[PDB]
Amino acid sequence: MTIGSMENVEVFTSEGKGRGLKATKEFWAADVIFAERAYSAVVFDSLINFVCHTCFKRQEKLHRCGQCKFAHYCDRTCQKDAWLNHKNECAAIKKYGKVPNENIRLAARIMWRVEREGTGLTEGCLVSVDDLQNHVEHFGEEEQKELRVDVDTFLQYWPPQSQQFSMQYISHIFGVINCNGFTLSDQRGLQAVGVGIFPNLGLVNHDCWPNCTVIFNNGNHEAVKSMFHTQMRIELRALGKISEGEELTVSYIDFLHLSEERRRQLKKQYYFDCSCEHCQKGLKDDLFLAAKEDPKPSQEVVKEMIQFSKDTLEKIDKARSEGLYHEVVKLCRECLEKQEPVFADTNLYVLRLLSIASEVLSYLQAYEEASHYARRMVDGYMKLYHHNNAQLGMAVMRAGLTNWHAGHIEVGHGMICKAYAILLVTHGPSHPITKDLEAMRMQTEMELRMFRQNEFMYHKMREAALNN
Ligand SMILES: Nc1ncnc2c1ncn2[C@@H]1O[C@H](C[C@@H](N)CC[C@H](N)C(=O)O)[C@@H](O)[C@H]1O
Ligand SMILES: [Zn+2]
Ligand SMILES: [Zn+2]
Ligand SMILES: [Zn+2]
């Protein structure tokens, strides 16, 4: 169907969850419930000269805008498509002679658009940008002060010839940005490169074990104009069967934390007490802090082990933050060794170490060791995550690659295939990441075939040498 259309959903009022979205029909895993273009989006301050301001792709050669020396693009093409939103901030930045906060730039794009369209409601919309939820009234002292400063900078940056908004509406737009931004990723889903506002997605509530997942698709342009699958957009996809009338939900955080831990994060960032089934029953918590059972550690050998792991981790962080990779590995091996007799492999402290060890070892190009930890982590992840979870998918793809690089083609291809299957649900066939994985699956198939033929030839050799 088409980007912007919300037919498959309708707004409705929840108990204490305020507004929510429900399916107007039946859905199956991988179905695109709806797509949506960003109402406004900006590049993070860190990455102003390394990411396209139109499409958010990383690239070795970008072309800066001769007029402001701020905006960068992949092509004159991405530069043209950006003009509509960039005209005003370009001319506005030259006048300010400084580049404002990323929040400030975003707030300005939102208001320039409200002005341009003389309204905050978009034609696709269930909600106008200014009616999104804003928890400003619960912002901490630092949060509030932070907002006063940006409003002031905003005022000096905001063109005098542009529609003047009241301070109340302005601080409100800032509140909305803090409680509604969607992080944007480069085309490889490697690093967060920007923040965007997607109104419709803004009506979907949270659940630690959601029935929907969201993906940002950078889009592509190579001949053949106006095509749904190549348009920059975010999509809300079904992770499984969703009945008509069922409320749609996504997860605001990563699932790999204790229910108490998740509630704390959700309460702090989204001012609410999560009441999903997983948090109320503490589902998976036993697995999250699983101890072994052949010997069965005492209640105290565990408490010491968790404390020790908590200790090792932060220590590993420091070292990693200083580029001391070998030290990081050393610390990981030692802790994993001590954990073996106590924790099972679904225990979050074990998994954390495996993921870290596997990452650094891969970076150090020690693929053989990395592939072992990578396999263990995937096996543990498989018992915790929803089988169509995007993080699980991305993690399996990575473990698959490390195994491939180490020469373990059988295990590599298998993992790559499992990842591809998951990504087809969470990212779709047209996503940049799904395409790179498909290309990888193709290469591993051929290498596996070459591996299997080599073996069958040794069998034909033994055959002939024996006369069957
Ligand atoms: N499971 C939940 N239980 C209670 N409140 C929630 C839940 N999930 C989201 N919310 C609330 O919804 C806010 C974010 C919105 N993007 C979601 C739709 C919102 N319910 C609305 O009326 O616009 C959060 O900051 C919470 O205040
Ligand atoms: Zn671009
Ligand atoms: Zn410019
Ligand atoms: Zn929950």
Measure 285 CA to ligand 4 centroid, in angstroms: 12
Q: How far apart are CA 80 and CA 248, in angstroms?
A: 36
**Tokens for 305?**
């082990």
Closest CA to 207 of 425, 17, 411: 17
271 lines ligand 1 (CB under 6 A): yes
Is the Cβ–Cβ distance between 208 and 284 less than 8 Å? no
Closest Cα to atom 5 of ligand 1: 17
Instruction: Tell me the C-alpha to C-alpha distance, in Å, between residue 407 and each of 187, 334, 400, 413, 451.
Output: 27, 26, 11, 11, 11
Torsion angles phi and psi, residue 291, rounded to 5: -105, 165
Ligand located closest to 15 CA: 1
Q: Is the CB of 214 under 6 A from ligand 1?
A: no
Whats the size of the chain, residue-wise?
468
Distances (CA, A) of 152 to 44, 101, 137, 358: 20, 12, 19, 46
Q: Which amino acid is at 357?
A: A
Q: Which two tokens stand for residue 219?
A: 């889009």
Protein residue with least CA distance to atom 6, ligand 1: 17
Q: Distance, CA 389 to ligand 4 centroid (Å)? A: 16
Alpha carbon distance 373, 292 (integer Å): 18
Nearest atom in ligand 1 to the alpha carbon of residue 16 is 4
Specify whether the CB–CB gap between 106 and 177 falls below 8 A.
yes
- Domains of the chain, first to last: 1-36+198-254 (2.170.270.10), 37-197 (no CATH), 255-467 (1.25.40.10)
Which residues crowd ion ligand 3, with CB under 5 Å? 65, 67-68, 71, 90
Residue 270 in contact with ligand 1 by CB distance below 6 A = yes
Contacting residues for 386 by C-beta, under 8 A, at least 6 apart: 209, 210, 239, 255, 392
Q: Is the CB of 272 under 6 A from ligand 1?
A: yes
Q: State which amino acid sits at residue 192.
A: A
d(CA 253, CA 134): 19
Q: Whose CA is nearest to atom 22 of ligand 1?
A: 19
Number of Cβ atoms within 10 Å of the Cβ of 13? 8
Which atom number of ligand 1 is nearest to the Cα of residue 132? Answer: 23
Return the residue matching tokens 């002679």.
97
Helix crossing, 299-320 with 348-363: angle to 10°?
30
Question: Contact 440/417 with Cβ under 8 angstroms?
Answer: no
Q: Which atom of ligand 1 is nearest to the CA of 202?
A: 16
